[PDB]
Design an enzyme around this catalytic site. Structure first.
Site, short mmCIF file in Angstrom:
data_model
loop_
_atom_site.label_atom_id
_atom_site.label_comp_id
_atom_site.label_asym_id
_atom_site.label_seq_id
_atom_site.Cartn_x
_atom_site.Cartn_y
_atom_site.Cartn_z
N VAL A 60 0.82 -1.19 0.00
CA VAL A 60 0.00 0.00 0.00
C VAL A 60 0.84 1.23 0.00
O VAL A 60 0.39 2.29 -0.41
CB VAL A 60 -0.98 0.12 1.15
CG1 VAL A 60 -2.04 -0.98 0.98
CG2 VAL A 60 -0.32 0.09 2.54
N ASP A 61 2.08 1.11 0.51
CA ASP A 61 3.03 2.20 0.56
C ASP A 61 3.47 2.61 -0.82
O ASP A 61 3.62 3.80 -1.10
CB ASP A 61 4.27 1.85 1.42
CG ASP A 61 5.03 3.11 1.87
OD1 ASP A 61 4.42 3.95 2.57
OD2 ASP A 61 6.23 3.24 1.51
#
Length: 79
Positions: A60-61
């Site tokens: 998600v980063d």
């Protein structure tokens, strides 16, 4: 100008998905490496699933940086 524009949009993506996607890479590596070394001595039933949360915390980063670097790459193709 036209050239500077392609230069702007190129280095934009490299500051974007350069920064986050590596921060992602090391945290999947760090956190998700250590967290499965918590799962090992336990059964890999329950804390294998929390170890998901951690490699996913990494995925998600890099996501909004790769999708913005995609938007910057398509914009480079126009410029």
């Amino acid at each position: 100008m036209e050239n500077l524009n392609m230069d702007l949009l190129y280095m934009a993506a490299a500051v974007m998905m350069g920064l986050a996607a590596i921060g992602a890479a090391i945290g999947i590596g760090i956190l998700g490496g250590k967290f499965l070394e918590g799962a090992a001595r336990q059964p890999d039933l329950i804390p294998l699933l929390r170890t998901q949360f951690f490699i996913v915390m990494g995925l998600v980063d890099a996501i909004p940086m790769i999708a913005v670097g995609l938007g910057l790459y398509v914009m480079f193709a126009v410029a």
